Amino acid sequence: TRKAVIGYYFIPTNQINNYTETDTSVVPFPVSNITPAKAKQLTHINFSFLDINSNLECAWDPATNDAKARDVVNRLTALKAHNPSLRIMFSIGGWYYSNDLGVSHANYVNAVKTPASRAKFAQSCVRIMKDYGFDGVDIDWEYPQAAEVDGFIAALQEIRTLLNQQTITDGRQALPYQLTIAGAGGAFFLSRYYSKLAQIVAPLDYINLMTYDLAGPWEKVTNHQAALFGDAAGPTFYNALREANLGWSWEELTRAFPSPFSLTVDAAVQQHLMMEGVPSAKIVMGVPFYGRAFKGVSGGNGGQYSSHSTPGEDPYPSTDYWLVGCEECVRDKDPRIASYRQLEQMLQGNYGYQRLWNDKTKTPYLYHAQNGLFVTYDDAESFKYKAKYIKQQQLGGVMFWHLGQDNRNGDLLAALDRYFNAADYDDSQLDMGTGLRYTGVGPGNLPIMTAPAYVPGTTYAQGALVSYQGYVWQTKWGYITSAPGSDSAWLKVGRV
Amino acid sequence: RKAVIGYYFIPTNQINNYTETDTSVVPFPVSNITPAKAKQLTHINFSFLDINSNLECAWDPATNDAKARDVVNRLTALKAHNPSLRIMFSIGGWYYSNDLGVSHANYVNAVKTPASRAKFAQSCVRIMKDYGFDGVDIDWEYPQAAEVDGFIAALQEIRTLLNQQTITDGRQALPYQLTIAGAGGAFFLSRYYSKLAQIVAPLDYINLMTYDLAGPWEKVTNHQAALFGDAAGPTFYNALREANLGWSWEELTRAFPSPFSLTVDAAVQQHLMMEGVPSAKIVMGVPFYGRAFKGVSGGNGGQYSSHSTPGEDPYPSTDYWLVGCEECVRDKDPRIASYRQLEQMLQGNYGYQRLWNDKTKTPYLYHAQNGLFVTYDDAESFKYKAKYIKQQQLGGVMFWHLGQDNRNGDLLAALDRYFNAADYDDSQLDMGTGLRYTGVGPGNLPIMTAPAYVPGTTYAQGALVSYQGYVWQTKWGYITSAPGSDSAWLKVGRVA
């Protein structure tokens, strides 16, 4: 019942190998920066990232110094002394390793191919968990394609079976080992496995939606990267879910998936809740602790919805770290991404940025009038609306990328914990606004309705409603003599 | 040679009191089919037989068997004048087999199991041999999804038996044939559309009931058998988009434009869009009768007007209001009139005007004083339907029914002339600018040319590539998957 607050702790292999808690030049965010107060505000820390090797087993990256790796992980599990309920999970995958064109992509595909490969892979996940002292497994494959989905599902079920046996063997009933995955937060990648969402979520404790990065340099016009609700003035997109292999009829597809639609956090959450068998309590909303920056924008609407000239490649070519005042962008060699920590310092600098607010999307943005820069990010104010949304929709909690990007005081994490748990915070009157809501209707969110029982032998007119086998149905055309479900002439429109 | 299939319908009461010298008892005896007419037909479908509660093909129980044999003998005697003429028998029809029909349960149960199908199939061959028929036609209107696999298995079973009987009887020169009557409009066609290739495989022909596309059941008057669409007329919901095909939204939308014009061309093109349906097995049905409407406004010759015609089956006494229609009084229904009777009404001074619609290529009658509209076909509309049959390479024509032609047999003569006369030339007939059905599906994908797909490439929106036999187009951008592996690709053409 306590909402989950899942923070990623991302540490590159080079920083593990040279770990140190006293030189921010080498390790910007050491474990010691996670104080007892922050440890009590978290429910899960996702250590990232591990990978799947050529032997099709969960494994640390080959360049990892195992003695150092163990030392970092032990410092994380030590945090449990301050919060007995905290779980240190490990994440496998991430964009770099697992995307279609990623370095280890083939290992993900092959690991879940056969009954034999799956068993071996599942056992290796439990082995790494026990050997290093982790509390559970998170898999971040971005993302399995339609043909790989059945194998993925079978592999999750196998891991669930082994974790459940391990929880009993280890006497962990009070804090069972858990299994989660990161899921797409936008329709284009979600369409890959959408038709099997219920089977994917069944063995999980949570599915952590990556409801951010919804706007990037790969887009034609600038936009908010995590708009909660839509702005009619902003761009709209093709609803890729209408093309998923669902087997539904044209009317069913059209009412579930309006197109074009606004690519927002609310749309991703509602698309998951439209599927039958997907409980709201397992859905976790992801939020970013960073902003994305664009250059070459136009004046007019504060940099919003403007064409721009930002390079979209990985990586980026030394050309000016044009992000004014972002020192962090210089050591990371990319001015397109900045941590909230860096953003805060840029705002209260004398750099020339202005903080503006979009009251439909309920998100802030920075505009640099002089240099034509646009930055979309989230802060403690946008989090009020997202936390209220989580509570109203009865979602499982929130997840964020990533811990090292919060400011020194841990203000972003403290805000989320306050909105869910503080006795002196009350959002009963917070105005959620008039932004556009996703209005598709699917099997999972049909309205409850009342209708007279279907009577065999009866001829029905167009638009007639009847109740049959737990649902209310409506005729799509006239003179119908067939029963609901036996004919393509009936459309399921309600339940009960 | 194109098929010319005429139905000869004779009700049980006429068989029982059969006579060739009293039109008050039998309006159209077999003697009306002269050697000239017999040479113009390739098949006569005697109708109708039924399926009894023992799940065997049988004559209506009220039938006097001796009289039934005598009528069938008079029909088979015609083979004297035309050695290639086949006398088929038809099982079913609307009265016996519609969902609410008296014998519907027998059709459904006869196809349920291997045993009931073997018994039923055997009974069809037995009746065929015992009475001297040349083949079997089944007119079940219409099996519903669940029944379709059983119906397909029953057709395969009958086909094996006929093929064997052909050998047995040394009929290799005029083999026994199997046909069915199929729906000529999308509403009923949607019941079995997805399995159309399987249904047609065992048949010599599928005879489409491309008439009765307009009637008192509709709120606006319209042509019952328009060849092409008139943009000024009504449009309808395309029910095929609701068939259980399993196609994506884009595929359904491209194949099934909606609303669309309910025409003969639409029904034919809808069949040709499915893979595995050869044009040579498709037979176009035409009516030898007209449908009348009363209470029509005056705007456009009574076309596309509201009306006050009752749609119930048994009509209610009230004025046989179709002026000059004597047949209507005897048949107690003023809503349908044989061509023979329409011709007489046009020759009398009753006030009808014969008008022509150059988009639909069909005639219609309008009565200004009484506000009457009649939609029918004649020798002129048949020129366009015959040319369409030749252009589209269909198997031939079918018509309902022989007894409605005029005494000289002008409609049948016209059809024979358009397909076979050496002195008829339709090379210059203008097919008009009426609306053509333009859906694209699996069976009519165009040959297209495109660069081969290259793995490792990221494709932009709208890109075209050839891969595994087809040309595919991306539906959104940044595609890293291979065609056919996720939902981002749309099949748009075939590779040569």
List the domain boundaries for chain B.
1-287+378-445, 288-377, 446-496
d(CA B165, CA B175): 9
Catalytic residue flag (residue A344): no
Which tokens in the block code for residue B65? Answer: 């068997």
- Residue numbers in B near A487 (CB within 8 A): 144-145, 191
d(CA B91, CA B181): 10
Residue type at A262? S
- Residues in Cβ contact with B28 at an 8 Å cutoff, skipping those fewer than 6 apart: B10, B402, B403
- Tell the burial category of B64 from Cβ atoms under 10 Å away from its Cβ (0-12, 13-18, 19+): middle
CATH 3.40.50.620, domain A447-496, yes or no: no
The answer to whether A140 touches A8, Cβ cutoff 8 Å, is no
The answer to whether A148 touches A111, Cβ cutoff 8 Å, is no
**Cβ–Cβ of B249/A250 closer than 8 Å?**
yes
d(CA A263, CA B284): 49
HEC letters along A78-128: HHHHCCCCCEEEEEEECHHHHCCCCCCHHHHHHHCCCHHHHHHHHHHHHHH
**Cβ–Cβ of A240/B487 closer than 8 Å?**
yes
Among partner residues B246, B458, B485, which is closest to A145 by beta-carbon distance? B485
Which tokens in the block code for residue B398? Answer: 């079918």
The superfamily (CATH) of domain B1-287+378-445 is: Glycosidases (3.20.20.80)
In Å, how far from its chain's centre is CA A488? 36
SS3 B150: helix
The dotted CATH code for A1-288+379-446 is: 3.20.20.80
Which tokens in the block code for residue B484? Answer: 């056919």
d(CA A353, CA A367): 6
The helix (run of H) or strand (run of E) holding residue A45 is: strand A44-52
Among partner residues B187, B481, B486, which is closest to A477 by beta-carbon distance? B187
User: What are the residues of chain A with a beta carbon less than 8 Å away from any beta carbon of chain B?
Assistant: 99-101, 145-147, 188, 191-192, 218, 237-238, 240, 242-245, 247, 249-251, 253-254, 257, 457, 459, 476-479, 481-482, 486-489
**Chosen from A488, A490, A492 to mutate, greatest number of chain B CBs within 10 A:** A488
Strand-pairing partners, residue A480, are A460
CATH 2.10.10.20, domain B446-496, yes or no: yes
Cα within 13 Å of Cα(A456), Cβ side = 3
Cα within 13 Å of Cα(B208), Cβ side = 32
The dotted CATH code for A289-378 is: 3.10.50.10
User: Parallel, antiparallel, or unpaired for β A465-468 and B464-467?
Assistant: unpaired
* Architecture of the domain made up of B288-377: Roll (3.10)
DSSP H helical ranges for A170-196: 187-190
Which tokens in the block code for residue A27? Answer: 């390790």
The answer to whether A43 touches A2, Cβ cutoff 8 Å, is yes
The answer to whether B235 touches B259, Cβ cutoff 8 Å, is yes
Determined by which method?
A: X-ray
Length of chain A: 496
The answer to whether A84 touches A21, Cβ cutoff 8 Å, is no
DSSP B421-475: -TT---TT----SPBPP----GGGPPB---PBP-TT--BPTT-EEEETTEEEEES
Among partner residues B98, B256, B476, which is closest to A238 by beta-carbon distance? B476
**Cβ–Cβ of B249/A243 closer than 8 Å?**
yes
Strands, sheet with B352-357, edge to edge from the N-terminal-most edge strand: B336-338, B289-294, B372-375, B362-367, B352-357
Resolution in Å equals 1.9
Which tokens in the block code for residue B291? Answer: 């449908």
Q: Residue B300 phi/psi, 5° resolution?
A: -120, 60
- Residues in Cβ contact with B154 at an 8 Å cutoff, skipping those fewer than 6 apart: B110, B111, B117, B120, B121
